[PDB]
Design a protein around this nucleic acid. Sequence first.
RNA 1: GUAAAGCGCACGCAGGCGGUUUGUUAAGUCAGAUGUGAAAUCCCCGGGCUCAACCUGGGAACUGCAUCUGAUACUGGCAAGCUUGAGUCUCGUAGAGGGGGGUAGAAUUCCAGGUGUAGCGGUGAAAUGCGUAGAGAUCUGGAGGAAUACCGGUGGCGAAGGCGGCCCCCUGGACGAAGACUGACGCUCAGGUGCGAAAGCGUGGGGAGCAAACAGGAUUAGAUACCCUGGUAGUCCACGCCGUAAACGAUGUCGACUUGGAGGUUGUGCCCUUGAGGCGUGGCUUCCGGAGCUAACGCGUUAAGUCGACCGCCUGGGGAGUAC
RNA 2: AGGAGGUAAAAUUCU
Lengths: 129, 218, 88
Amino acid sequence: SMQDPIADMLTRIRNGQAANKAAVTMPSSKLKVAIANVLKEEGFIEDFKVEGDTKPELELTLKYFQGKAVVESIQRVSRPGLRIYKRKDELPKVMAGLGIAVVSTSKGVMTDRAARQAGLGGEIICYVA
Amino acid sequence: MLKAGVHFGHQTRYWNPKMKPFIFGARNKVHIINLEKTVPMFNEALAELNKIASRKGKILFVGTKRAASEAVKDAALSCDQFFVNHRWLGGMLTNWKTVRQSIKRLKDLETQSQDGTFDKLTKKEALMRTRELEKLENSLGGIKDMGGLPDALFVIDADHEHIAIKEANNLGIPVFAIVDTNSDPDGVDFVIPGNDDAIRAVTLYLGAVAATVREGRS
Amino acid sequence: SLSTEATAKIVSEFGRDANDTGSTEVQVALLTAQINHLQGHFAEHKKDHHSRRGLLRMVSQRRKLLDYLKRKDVARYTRLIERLGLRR
RNA sequence: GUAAAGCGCACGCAGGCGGUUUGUUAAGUCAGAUGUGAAAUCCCCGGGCUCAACCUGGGAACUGCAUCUGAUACUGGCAAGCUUGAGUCUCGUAGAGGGGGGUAGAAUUCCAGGUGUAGCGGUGAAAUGCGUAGAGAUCUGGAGGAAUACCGGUGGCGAAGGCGGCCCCCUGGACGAAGACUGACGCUCAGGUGCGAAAGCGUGGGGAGCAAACAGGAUUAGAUACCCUGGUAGUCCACGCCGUAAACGAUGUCGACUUGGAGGUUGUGCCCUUGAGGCGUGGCUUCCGGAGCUAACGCGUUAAGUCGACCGCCUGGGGAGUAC
RNA sequence: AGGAGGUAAAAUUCU
Ligand SMILES: [Mg+2]
Ligand SMILES: [Mg+2]
Ligand SMILES: [Mg+2]
Ligand SMILES: [Mg+2]
Ligand SMILES: [Mg+2]
Ligand SMILES: [Mg+2]
Ligand SMILES: [Mg+2]
Ligand SMILES: [Mg+2]
Ligand SMILES: [Mg+2]
Ligand SMILES: [Mg+2]
Ligand SMILES: [Mg+2]
Ligand SMILES: [Mg+2]
Ligand SMILES: [Mg+2]
Ligand SMILES: [Mg+2]
Ligand SMILES: [Mg+2]
Ligand SMILES: [Mg+2]
Ligand SMILES: [Mg+2]
Ligand SMILES: [Mg+2]
Ligand SMILES: [Mg+2]
Ligand SMILES: [Mg+2]
């Protein structure tokens, strides 16, 4: 429901991109933006708008290739009934390096590629590939 | 950039939903199409069949259904290739390893509608022999005398040639067909919307692709 | 669901003006008011099981939202139940 | 869903879970620092008994705990809000939603007569049975009980069970439209509560039809049956039990997200009533079907596709939903 | 050319 909105976010865009849509409208939270920004900073999308108000509306564009979507997998890992946190040394390598794992931390959100070269950990939120 | 007068888009509430992006139709329910999508889908399709008609390419006209049947029997006999006109025989290509050997039974008794024995024996062999000749010539001018792997063919109605489009897709052969407002595009790399059904409209595409290809490189 | 006129009365005193129809005070008041009158309906009839099913919603809901405020604005409750009747 | 598995249905305590913005804390979370995590054992590199097993030096490892110091995105606490989830008010809509009382109309049975004469009824064929006090047929009249033909329809309504003539009284829910108030008041729910076809039980009342049991006629090798003549419980009402069904869509509840076609049905916003409209937009609903799912059958915006919250349940056939 | 109503009775078994 509106119980796991980030998972609702990842769904929007999953059977979004499967459905070959142009983009997808969506309610905004100060978080959703901060995860979108990493999908931008890693080119799983082209870019996101806030399309805001007092009832924010973050939209965000497609990103395809040859004929397919660039997101060949986007699932929710940690989640409301089962929260997941990793240490710095022990964090995941999605497709053993290719593709990322977005992970909150004492310093904003941020990626797994980034997570270490910085040197800390936190809530691993989704796996993106 | 109309070029083609009375034409628009025909056929009604059948329409493949995955044919939304090229159709600004409605109108009495017979939804008409975006025509400045079809003609740039010519200037790319009608175009890039000379990059191949210069490569000594060998097309193949494909048109059946009792409606402008032997309208395709035309310059097609010349247009650096040939045709196929009455029912799509299951895998003449696909299974060229055979049926190819039924051109034989034709051109054998073809050069025999006039050459060697064409009357000598009984006049009961009379019709039954020409009945063979009669039964396949309106079924495979298809090859007459060919040569190659007929690369890229041209089909009037996309899905009425149900088979032809698939068989081509299994073999790697190109595509080149038109889609009115109900046939599944999907398997036609060179898609030319318009309309499959109208004696007028069909002869326009036919006449336009018959041109352009005929000028291979002289 | 009582009379379209009725409830007109009860939005006052409970509410800060008329058409302030959404303060948790009023619905509770609207509910109780029906329930109470509506216990008459189940005196007679009484084998009217279905109608009762709707009743308990009123009671469930009433109680559910009587608990909501217990968390917000303390003694915004202890100024309405006695004002009404019910804490059994 | 059909293989074992979704409680028959709903309401709700605990608990799990939770929209969105600011601060605030530092619980969870993350980083470091120090302490500690005996030795042997396993591992790595060596040493030594002729080699090996074995003995042995040193290291790594002991996936951990505690404390002090920080970081503060995410979760939680505290604070204050927000309105979009949610509820309240307003005018209406259709409905076999539920409860009470009322009344109509057609038929079956029976009671009394009128006329009327030897047959009626029933089956595969019969016979039991009914008729010479007169049947069946027919007419008129009068009882009484149960059920509502036609409307009626892949129609509506209900949480499920389930609800159909007409009439008023009491009452539940769903849905539409504008705007008004509320300001997360939520979702799910082990326990707990209640609803729950038919048969069945109690107390009485009721009893036209139908019909377990029972009887007689057939049938048959037998016929404790299927068929025929009868027929009690019961089926009906009242009040209290019982609590189970292939209670099924064999498909738990909520929310969000993904091409389409024919409809059915019930609203409502806009535009010459300009039609029994033109153009839209809600809720429910039936058939077909894409992608995708599937073991296949099939499902396919009312999912069995894509997700997330929470509950229930399965772990080979039997034994057994049995014993205690 | 739709609907309607009537057309098969009982009859077991096979290391
Ligand atoms: Mg089963
Ligand atoms: Mg169920
Ligand atoms: Mg949360
Ligand atoms: Mg040695
Ligand atoms: Mg040790
Ligand atoms: Mg917080
Ligand atoms: Mg009479
Ligand atoms: Mg009577
Ligand atoms: Mg009502
Ligand atoms: Mg009960
Ligand atoms: Mg009963
Ligand atoms: Mg009884
Ligand atoms: Mg059971
Ligand atoms: Mg049922
Ligand atoms: Mg279907
Ligand atoms: Mg649909
Ligand atoms: Mg589902
Ligand atoms: Mg038992
Ligand atoms: Mg037999
Ligand atoms: Mg025997």
